[PDB]
Amino acid sequence: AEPEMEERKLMGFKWIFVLTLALLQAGYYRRLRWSVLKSRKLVLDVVN
Amino acid sequence: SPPPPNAMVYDRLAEAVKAKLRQLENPDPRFLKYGSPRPTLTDHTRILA
Hints:
Chain A is mainly α. Chain A has 2 helices and no strands. Chain B has 2 helices and no strands. Chain B: This is mitochondrial processing peptidase.
């Protein structure tokens, strides 16, 4: 029924591992571009 | 410790807009007796001599 199961489980270990490295790069790249906004100071004049 | 409603300039400039609008709410019914904004058709025969 499934003559492809060994070519399939070996290709899926190679690309789930490689894609969890690109997820660690993209969460650093996101928090680096957003740090000037996330730490800025703002004074406004309004009280209530 | 909320500011009172005369302490900030924007809070007491807003109690003066509400007081300008409360004199548009009590109309005098003796100044509304003859005039109407709806047009009607009338008869002018007594004055046309």
